[PDB]
Design a binder for this molecule. Sequence first.
Ligand SMILES: *[C@@H]1O[C@H](CO)[C@@H](O)[C@H](O)[C@H]1NC(C)=O
Ligand SMILES: *[C@@H]1O[C@H](CO)[C@@H](O)[C@H](O)[C@H]1NC(C)=O
Ligand SMILES: *[C@@H]1O[C@H](CO)[C@@H](O)[C@H](O)[C@H]1NC(C)=O
Lengths: 172, 173, 170, 321, 322, 322
Amino acid sequence: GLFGAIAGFIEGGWQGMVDGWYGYHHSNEQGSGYAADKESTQKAIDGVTNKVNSIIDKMNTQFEAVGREFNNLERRIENLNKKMEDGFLDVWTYNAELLVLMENERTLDFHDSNVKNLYDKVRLQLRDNAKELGNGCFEFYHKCDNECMESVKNGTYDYPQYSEEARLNREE
Amino acid sequence: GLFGAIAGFIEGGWQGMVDGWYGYHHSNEQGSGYAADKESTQKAIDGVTNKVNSIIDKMNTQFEAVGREFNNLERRIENLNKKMEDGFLDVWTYNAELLVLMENERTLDFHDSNVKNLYDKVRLQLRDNAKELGNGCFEFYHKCDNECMESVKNGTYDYPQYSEEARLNREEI
Amino acid sequence: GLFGAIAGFIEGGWQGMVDGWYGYHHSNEQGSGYAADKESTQKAIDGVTNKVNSIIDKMNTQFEAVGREFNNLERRIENLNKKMEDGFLDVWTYNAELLVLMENERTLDFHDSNVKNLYDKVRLQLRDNAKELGNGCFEFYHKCDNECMESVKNGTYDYPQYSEEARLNR
Amino acid sequence: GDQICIGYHANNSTEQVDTIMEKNVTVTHAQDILEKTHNGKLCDLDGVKPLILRDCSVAGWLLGNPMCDEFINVPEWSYIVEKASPANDLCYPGDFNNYEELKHLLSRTNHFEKIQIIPKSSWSNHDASSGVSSACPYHGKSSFFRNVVWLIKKNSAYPTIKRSYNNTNQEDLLVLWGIHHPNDAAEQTKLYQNPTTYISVGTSTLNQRLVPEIATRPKVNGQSGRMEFFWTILKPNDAINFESNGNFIAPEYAYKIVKKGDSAIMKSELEYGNCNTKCQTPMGAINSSMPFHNIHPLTIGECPKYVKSNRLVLATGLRNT
Amino acid sequence: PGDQICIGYHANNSTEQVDTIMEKNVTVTHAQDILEKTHNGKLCDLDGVKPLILRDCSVAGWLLGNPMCDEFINVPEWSYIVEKASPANDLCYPGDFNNYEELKHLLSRTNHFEKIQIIPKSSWSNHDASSGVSSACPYHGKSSFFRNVVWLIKKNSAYPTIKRSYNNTNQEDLLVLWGIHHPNDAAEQTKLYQNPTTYISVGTSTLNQRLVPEIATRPKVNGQSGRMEFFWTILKPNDAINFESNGNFIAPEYAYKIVKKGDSAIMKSELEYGNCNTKCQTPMGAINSSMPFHNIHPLTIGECPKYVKSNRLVLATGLRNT
Amino acid sequence: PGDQICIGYHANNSTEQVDTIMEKNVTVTHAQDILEKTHNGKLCDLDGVKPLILRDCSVAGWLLGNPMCDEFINVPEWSYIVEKASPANDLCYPGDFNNYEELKHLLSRTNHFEKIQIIPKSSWSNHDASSGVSSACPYHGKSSFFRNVVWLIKKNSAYPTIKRSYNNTNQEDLLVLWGIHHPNDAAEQTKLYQNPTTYISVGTSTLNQRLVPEIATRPKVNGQSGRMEFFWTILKPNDAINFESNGNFIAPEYAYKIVKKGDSAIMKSELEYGNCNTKCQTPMGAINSSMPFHNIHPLTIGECPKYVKSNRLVLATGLRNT
Ligand SMILES: *[C@@H]1O[C@H](CO)[C@@H](O)[C@H](O)[C@H]1NC(C)=O
Ligand SMILES: *[C@@H]1O[C@H](CO)[C@@H](O)[C@H](O)[C@H]1NC(C)=O
Ligand SMILES: *[C@@H]1O[C@H](CO)[C@@H](O)[C@H](O)[C@H]1NC(C)=O
């Protein structure tokens, strides 16, 4: 897609992550495990919800057809009436079909963009304390326990704390 | 945002930079300060001005209601008249409101994109000569004087001419 | 542009690539030359083609003006007929003009994004086995023959192959 | 050793959306926003029953076609249902003047109450009993419209009618009357004595004169004669004046407009479905949470918005794997 | 050794908010409101041309010359016409105005009506001109009539056949008005016009009518049991109008030169003259704005922003504020 | 040591420009025009079917049989109808056509009229069917009349009551036309018809009318102070039309079978036949285009592109050019 994350440098989605839309898989000494990122999932839910409500709201004040009748000496205005009603009908059909199409593409890219941003958030926290596999994964040059993993997900990872240990292990 | 920069990897804006929309903060041996990137700012002002104008211009031929009168024997046509005028009025109201909603989104992304492009512009201009701090800042592996600072702001930086002392410090740091 | 690639970090386009929209240029011992990325160009063709068709299809149900006549004691309905037909003409003229405008910008951004994604596909494949010049080019930390240069265009490039040569150079 | 990976959701779903640039894209979560389902029935609207005219037309009902007695007294309605071509319309052939304009008034009405404005027994100088036709039979007996009276000369004379009715009620009044068009000069004298007749009707805003139009005509329902019916709205405190020396079809009953509101005349072949709904179409009732539907453009009540498309699906999740 | 360059973006004290598809009330550094929401609540001149404000008179009242409408006996060029929802002074003597709405429309295509005499009132030698008045049309507590038409009555128990003509020898189209009196009974027909069987015939190059009076008792309106019915025609330069009648004829005296045609309007407003000047006028008040949109009233005249129904329309120009 | 691979995009010698919401006149590398701006300036057949060009005649002139419209005495199947803004050959004898605009609308739902005789001119043995001609309808310097209708005069100072009828036993709907003459005075009434008080009555199973002539004094139009008013009805298969009159009757002679109903149009244009074929026709000329949009004229017939008011509609396919 537009941002290269979904079906891009991350080749596929995870069947094993039922918790949310985006998240992490971590495997340290204390075992592996899937976990959702709550900050970005809630942001996406909120965005998508607002979009849906916005579309419905823009359509609540929309043309309503009324039945009018005419005699055989009123064909011109009957033809005009029909043409007027069918005209708004077509115009509102167009607006709805087009809005749905345009927003669907945007929703798809919105997700793509969130995934990349989540990945960059981790990448910019870790720097050279970890090796960038190139498929959405990071190999730690130091030992990172569950509480350390949580600081990565929390956005509070302490780079200076592990940098010296990472420097030496890397240099080997 | 869509591009991860504004309120993203750059946490907040600067109350101190009043010269434009996007720019730099430098810090070296001879003092620190704020300066705006005039180029990308002007590029953005022109884009936004034109966007505003084309929105206004596209509504230049919208429906204009004309008052008509009918007697008590012309209720069908009076009703046809009202529903058709309200019809176009609702349509154009939708067009106006929807265009502003959609473009407002695209504008915020535009600015986000521009901050991200300016960041990348410096990034590849410095290479390893400097260090990505991950917060929008680069720490130089060498001494960067005021004319070195205005070198990257002007967009004309010498990677090879500095790669000497940079590599030396980087290998030891 | 939105993705900072076309007329961004890649300053210009190549006249020498008549082969497609996006692709590569290689320099080695065997020689130099241009080549288009088949997969990248074909996806962008399908996308654009579909867009053009969606635009036309959605307009097939447009308003059709029909001429009507009135006598000179029917000036109110004549006026109403005129205003309504001009009204729909204007509405559909707006829809067409705006749709073209908006999707043009998306088409331009779409191409920008495809170049950006192609460049990243190469960067992630090569890792530190090459140097990033910052202009769209990669200088290899090992000798890469034409067979090795086709492996990066094809996607299946072997990193634990040239890990040795590139390691000791830095 | 230690690893962290960033990725996204996937699931078993097969739901599909479209974009400008790619059709049939599978996504993990999608939302349908389009109703395609109705119940095929004509229901009550917020507990208020519709008026279902069965085999009677609006004209048949309002004028009192002998075959439409089911509707001589009608309660408050939500909407009105008339067939495309009802059998029971103008039993005696002719026209309803401003008929379409009358139907439009009815669509802004919920409640008619019948009252007597001129008693049938008040015609001492005129025959009020022999104005019946084989064209308007009741059992197999010659009859006529119930709300209106066909006056015939009495004792070889037709004296000038001058009547006035004051609308003492609080409601607007729908008043109906008519003119008979005979087939030849000989019939004129036979029925009405006077050769050159007129009918003058007057309110404070209405001023009209009707003159018979004699012509030679083919039989419709066995009659070469014609009848043309006229109506007006009589405002509270206004009066209506009738003046005629022949061809007059006098009112007896008019309609109090007790409740005005939102209504409709629905064209539908269906009959009552003993149900309740919030939204009604001529094809059936809609019970839905969706914002859009594609059932029929002409609806009444709290309805989703009509659209012509066969599919409308919003993407909510991401591209599935 | 701690030399650094940082990349960032503007922030400020702005509180201005915009909406997007995905988020509401987003604070931004810069914004452009494009919607005008105010007016001065007054009916003004339109580019230095004063409107015609009919006050308590309707169009019919003005054109026929209801005696209560003497303010509008000779009106100067207008930019637009203002009429109330229910004008008090209409047909003082009750009745009908034939094709009234079509005349209203023609009037919205006009800017100036120059009144001219076409049949002088002193010209009726064999008919009583002066005693055709009614309590239904009072002036100063005294029986009067429409000023622009003449209600001719019999003279010395006689109503001779009238044959009058008028040639439009002017350079402009001419609006001409006349009428007919429908009496309440045969006795009133005798007392007013002597002849029991009467007619009015009117012919132009495009017009052909023969009116017969309709004698009938109708409910009292302003004391009157009879009715009057009015007709009008546009007579082109060099065309003539011929009247013939032996009773019930409401003859013209004054007609109207349509001297100027253009974009005019009949505005429905209860408001009165505001002694101001504007380029854009609504029925609720005048607009003075550079905004591309307004939400005051759909029915405007002049050089106006485009009408919309929103409460808010704010465009984002700057970025997301911190 | 210097082995290289570079990522790049296409550039060419294209000068094709597109617009966006933010940047106008962007030079693009591949574009697609979707707007047709061109036409052949001629009126053509629609899919091999020739239109009916009425030239200097009008619909009324054609159908009533104006002597100056003999080219349209028998018309073959048409695709559309072309009429001038001000056809010279309309109602040679002055008057009006009743419900003319409704008739034109019905005409626009028809492709084929076949003319048949319903009342032979020879069948009038007690009326003068030859002297009903006028200097208002000259042909080669001889007084004539409308070809399809008969102006009946008294014979031997007598106009007996007419009782004629016609049953439509054809399979098609029939358009039947007739008229009434309004004389200018009571003298002219007697000279033409003898009887002072006259009527025309017409009745089908749906139609009921009795017409009475309306005498008035009128200016001359084409040398005539008199007027004629024409009427029409559709006669259903197996329905009958009954006429009765004692004067002023303009009797049918020929009627029209509506043999083909379909999509048609009355096109307003000052052009004439161009001897061509097309799938899409405008009043300004024909379109031959694979394009989805055009800006030629809103009123088209046939398989046409969608109309927009734009000057340029160009869609970007390729990318930004260097
Ligand atoms: C989309 O898939 C559906 C499967 O039901 C198929 O019927 C349709 O043809 C497809 N549309 C396109 C454009 O491929
Ligand atoms: C947005 O904020 C405004 C304050 O001006 C408030 O009135 C409105 O309710 C808010 N809307 C939403 C959706 O929160
Ligand atoms: C775009 O440039 C072209 C030159 O052909 C011209 O048609 C157009 O007016 C220019 N428009 C703008 C906005 O510069």
